[PDB]
Design a protein around this ligand. Structure first.
Ligand SMILES: CC(C)C(=O)C(=O)O
Ligand SMILES: CC(C)C(=O)C(=O)O
Ligand SMILES: [Mn+2]
Ligand SMILES: [Mn+2]
Lengths: 405, 399
């Protein structure tokens, strides 16, 4: 049942606020600062930087997406999703997890063997750090012109204790032993242009100086340069606190990571507090270079950050996302087809209801803007500055329509 | 769909093969130029961590309802009101009675049947034309207390294209409304009236001006610390990043006249997908009050989600002062009232948000649950599950 909070008000709670204390077991949860650590960052700059360029995108729909699904992608559905990501303009695509999943392996073999990989596309494959998984991962990419090997291990306070029952050095040695193995294997398969990504998985549960240490040591092995750089990918595996703190944490890593101009700083935010998009946009302003997510926000649990929202959030403020969202219906249809999961009615940009006005006063206001833009134009209306109340973008700019209803 | 084939940007790294799309970005301008740059010096919100629940106002019966494909029946409206009351909300916007007969009908019914608990204050939306204000007051006849929420659009775009009207002229709309509100209140003693003013399209409005109109509306209403006014600053359209919203909110809280007779309330829509962030950063900015909906119903992309805001407090150890202990029940009732599903991936309530499919995550949660072993009272320490699903009446599902 649902029962009205009737506990005392807080000390200092103003008289005009009649809310009462719930019976929820708040004692079981700690503020982020105590669960992990306080914010390290001094003199942040991200609040003063407006994004004026698109980042490097990496679409993880085929891995992080696929793995969160109720109904796994068939070989047909993965090809279909690969082709969409390719046609949209994406250049780095995590095509799966071939050491752990025989159908992923099957998938990678297939796109390489059939010459499905375009010349400007770099496939990305996920692996854990154990040696024979790294080997399997290299065998799966055999024949590939280029590939990102993404190796990872969990570094969080919580996971060092209850999963690995291990200390800092040992947890770092896993990553570094993982980098050695990667370097060994890449020399065993010349031809392929091998590139690396390292994630301290559960980063947002990891102490920053410790995240920096592990990354730097991974860096030492790999020996990236400004022409052949490494990716350090900082996931909010669980989105653990507000977006500003994630950004602060990104700004700290970007200032502080060793060999910074040989590093591609990548964001990988999940949406557990509903703020994955904000985490990304602020973390990009904080100095990241790259963002991993999924079309329409598919991905474990609450999902990966939404590639469509981020892309169009740039477009609608005058920045070219470098991805084609001209026909958002088509993107959505393929997405829903691949994942077997609807895009919500109220999803930003693609949801069924997002260019709908039911309010009489909003329909009238939309009519005033649309009628006004005609005047100024009589150049060509479809080319003028968009100026319509309640319609952030011209719906025809993403192939949709405004409906008064 | 057409692969972007334009050139790279000047100075684009060689490791980024991305090409310019053919999308008409020249039609859109940065927020700084579309409205105004950031007015806020020495912001403080980035260093403040929320340590108490805001005053919640649910707008499901008004901003939510008007967004629906299928309008709430009288029964579904009662259901929603009851859910809101039962969860512990204390201010509920019940409709737009002056311009909607079924709204008007709903208001009469909750008042006449005694469906409002004494700690609950109903809210009614009205525009500024004087016959609409009169009608709003008539709808509330017999209520022991009510918030009359009047509003008018204040944005640069709306001043120009809708009102064909200047600053001064648009503020007199608000202040003439405030004056009418004071006349009407005097005409109906026996209800304790309180006021809310929103410069509608606030995020498309210069700040100096939004403060001007608010201060002016406030001077007429003459609020006090005991009888304070609500100034509600909506992101009618979520127009930029949530930091800038938070900034704008901080500047208004810092600079609004008679600040301790004010309840600064937030009203974020979700057009950029950052409503929850706008609210949270806006609250740290020193707002006092948030309007939203359960599960983020509302115009277009929705109001900010009251469920997400609430449980985001709980899961970091702040009592939201709202019972979310049966999220399935809250969800069932919302889906029924709205005729519109909570997404599978909606925070806290979605079908899949406590599912681990991948084996490593499954192993890891089992390490966590096993280490943990009264367990239900210990600190929740499990990888990949932000909360114990049972604290919201759900279960963890290994599949
Ligand atoms: C595999 C890792 C990078 C991941 O998906 C996450 O941590 O969110
Ligand atoms: C009525 C107003 C306050 C509103 O809902 C909005 O601005 O979104
Ligand atoms: Mn992930
Ligand atoms: Mn609204």
């Amino acid at each position: 049942t649902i029962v009205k909070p009737a506990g005392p008000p807080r000390v200092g709670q103003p008289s005009w606020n009649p809310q009462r204390a719930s019976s929820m077991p708040v004692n079981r949860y700690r503020p982020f600062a105590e669960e992990v650590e306080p914010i390290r960052l001094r003199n942040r700059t991200w609040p003063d930087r407006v994004i004026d360029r698109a980042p490097l995108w990496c679409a993880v729909d085929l891995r992080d997406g696929n793995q969160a699904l109720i109904d796994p992608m068939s070989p047909a559905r993965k090809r279909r999703m690969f082709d969409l990501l390719v046609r949209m303009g994406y250049k780095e695509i995590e095509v799966g997890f071939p050491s752990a999943s025989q159908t992923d392996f099957d998938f990678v073999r297939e796109i390489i063997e059939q010459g499905a990989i375009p010349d400007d596309v770099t496939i990305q494959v996920l692996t854990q750090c154990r040696p024979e998984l790294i080997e399997r991962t290299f065998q799966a990419c055999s024949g590939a012109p280029r590939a990102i090997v993404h190796f990872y291990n969990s570094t969080s306070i919580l996971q060092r204790r209850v999963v690995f029952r291990a200390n800092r050095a040992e947890v770092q040695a896993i990553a570094t032993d993982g980098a050695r193995k990667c370097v060994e294997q890449a020399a065993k398969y010349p031809g392929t242009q091998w590139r690396f990504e390292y994630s301290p998985e559960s980063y947002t549960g990891t102490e920053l100086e410790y995240a920096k240490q592990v990354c730097d040591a991974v860096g030492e092995v790999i020996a990236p340069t400004p022409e052949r750089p490494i990716i350090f990918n900082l996931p909010a595996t669980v989105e653990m606190t507000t977006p500003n703190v994630y950004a602060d944490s990104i700004e700290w890593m970007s200032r502080n990571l060793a060999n910074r101009e040989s590093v591609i700083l990548s964001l990988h935010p999940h949406n557990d507090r509903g703020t994955a998009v904000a985490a990304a946009e602020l973390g990009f302003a904080a100095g990241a270079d790259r963002i991993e997510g999924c079309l329409f926000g598919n991905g474990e649990r609450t999902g990966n950050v939404c590639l469509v929202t981020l892309g169009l959030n740039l477009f609608s403020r005058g920045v070219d996302p470098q991805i084609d969202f001209s026909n958002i219906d088509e993107i959505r249809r393929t997405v829903e087809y691949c994942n077997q999961l609807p895009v919500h009615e109220r999803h930003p940009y693609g949801g069924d209801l997002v260019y709908t006005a039911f309010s009489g006063s909003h329909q009238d206001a939309i009519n005033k803007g649309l009628d006004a833009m005609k005047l100024d134009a009589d150049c060509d209306v479809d080319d003028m500055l968009w100026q319509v109340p309640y319609l952030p973008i011209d719906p025809r700019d993403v192939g949709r329509t405004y409906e008064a209803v």
